[PDB]
C-alpha cells in the first residue's frame, strides 16, 4: 500500500539521466549579483554570499579559479561536480540555481542556507544526543541511497559539508569529489578522518567508501570527536587501517553495533555493501524508531532550529578574509572547461 521506494527511485533516475545527458550551461552572469561576504573556503575555492540585483534573493556562490583548478589537477573533478550537481534533485542536496564562467573563474550559484554548517553547531555543543545524531544520519542514509542508485559516489562526507536549513534538516554541499562510476575507481581523495581503509591502501574502491564515511560521521556526531584522530594525517591513516575502534562509555549498545558494521575494514562485511544493500542499515536496531518516509517527506520535528536573523544575515558562519574577485582580460583555460 506504501509508495514503492524502488519505483520512486526509478522515476528519479529517469529524471536525473535527462539532465546528466543534457546539462544546463551559462544560466546567469556575474554582474547579476552583488557580492556580500565570504561564507566558507575550501582547498579549491571560496563560497560567497551574494544578492541577486533584480529579485533581491540571496544565494551562495562558489567561485573557482580556473588556473588553480588546473594546477591542482582538479579539472575533471570540477566538471564532475558541476555536471552532477546540476542533474541531482533530492530534499537534502543543496540546489544549484545557476552556473557560469568568465575569463578567470567558474561560478556555481547555490541556494543559501543561513543556518550554518553542522560542524559549527557540533563543535560548539560538543556532541549530539543519539536521537539528534540519528535524525541527521537518517537524512544521509536516504541521500546516499538516492545518489548510489544513480551510480554516484559522493566521497566527501563530513560535518563541514552539511548545512542546517530553517526547518532543521540537512543540506549536503560540496560535490567536488562526486563521480558517476559503475564499478570501481581509484582516486586518492576525501578528508583524512573520513577515508575508508581501501582508499588509503590504494585499492580500487566503490560506493562502500560512503558507508564507511557515514560511520565516521555518526561516531563524530554522537561522540563529539572522530573515531580516528591525531595531529597529522599519517597517524590518522595508521589508526584507520588498524582498524581497531573504541567507543565512548555513553554510546548505546545498538549504536556500537551499527558503527562496528559501518567501520568494517572487510568490504565483504561492511553494512551498505552486502546482499541487502542499504536495507541492512535502514533495518538496523539503532534506526528502529526512524520513520524513513516521514524523514524523506520532512514531516519529523527537527531537534534544533538555527537562529534566524536573515534573509542575508551570516551570524551562523565564521568570518573569512576577503579577497577581490579578479577577472582577467584574457580567457584562461578555455578548452579545459568548455563543457562547464
Amino acid at each position: 500500500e506504501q509508495e514503492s521506494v524502488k519505483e520512486f527511485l526509478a522515476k528519479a533516475k529517469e529524471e536525473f539521466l535527462k539532465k546528466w545527458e543534457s546539462p544546463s550551461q551559462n544560466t546567469a552572469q556575474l554582474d547579476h549579483f552583488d557580492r556580500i561576504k565570504t561564507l566558507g573556503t575550501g582547498s579549491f575555492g571560496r563560497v560567497m554570499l551574494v544578492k541577486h540585483k533584480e529579485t533581491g534573493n540571496h544565494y551562495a556562490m562558489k567561485i573557482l579559479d580556473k588556473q588553480k583548478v588546473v594546477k591542482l589537477k582538479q579539472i575533471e573533478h570540477t566538471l564532475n561536480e558541476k555536471r552532477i550537481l546540476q542533474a541531482v534533485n533530492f530534499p537534502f542536496l543543496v540546489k544549484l540555481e545557476f552556473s557560469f564562467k568568465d575569463n578567470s573563474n567558474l561560478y556555481m550559484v547555490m541556494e543559501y542556507v543561513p543556518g550554518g554548517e553542522m560542524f559549527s553547531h557540533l563543535r560548539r555543543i560538543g556532541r549530539f544526543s543519539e536521537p539528534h545524531a540519528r535524525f541527521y544520519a537518517a537524512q544521509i542514509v536516504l541521500t546516499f541511497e538516492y545518489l548510489h542508485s544513480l551510480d554516484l559516489i559522493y566521497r566527501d562526507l563530513k560535518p563541514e559539508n552539511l548545512l542546517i536549513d530553517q526547518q532543521g534538516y540537512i543540506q549536503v554541499t560540496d560535490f567536488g569529489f562526486a563521480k558517476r562510476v559503475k564499478g570501481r575507481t581509484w582516486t586518492l581523495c576525501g578528508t583524512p578522518e573520513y577515508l575508508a581503509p581501501e582508499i588509503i591502501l590504494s585499492k580500487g574502491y566503490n560506493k562502500a567508501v560512503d558507508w564507511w564515511a557515514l560511520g565516521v560521521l555518526i561516531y563524530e556526531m554522537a561522540a563529539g570527536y572522530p573515531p580516528f584522530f591525531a595531529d597529522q594525517p599519517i597517524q590518522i591513516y595508521e589508526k584507520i587501517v588498524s582498524g581497531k575502534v573504541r567507543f565512548p562509555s555513553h554510546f548505546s549498545s545498538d549504536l556500537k553495533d551499527l558503527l562496528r558494521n559501518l567501520l568494517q575494514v572487510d568490504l565483504t562485511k561492511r553494512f551498505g555493501n552486502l546482499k541487502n544493500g542499504v536495507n541492512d542499515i535502514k533495518n538496523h536496531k539503532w534506526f528502529a524508531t526512524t520513520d524513513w518516509i516521514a524523514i524523506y517527506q520532512r514531516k519529523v520535528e527537527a531537534p534544533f532550529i538555527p537562529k534566524f536573523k536573515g534573509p542575508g544575515d551570516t551570524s551562523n558562519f565564521d568570518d573569512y578574509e576577503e579577497e577581490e574577485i579578479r577577472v582577467s582580460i584574457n580567457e584562461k583555460c578555455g578548452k579545459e572547461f568548455t563543457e562547464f
Binding site: 575550501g42 582547498s43 563541514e160 578528508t191 584522530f229
Partner: peptide, 18 residues
Amino acid sequence: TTYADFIASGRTGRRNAI
C-alpha cells in the same frame, strides 16, 4: 579523556580535503 585529547589536538577546526 579522549575528549580532552581531541580538544588539545590540532585538528578541531575545519578540515580540508586532500
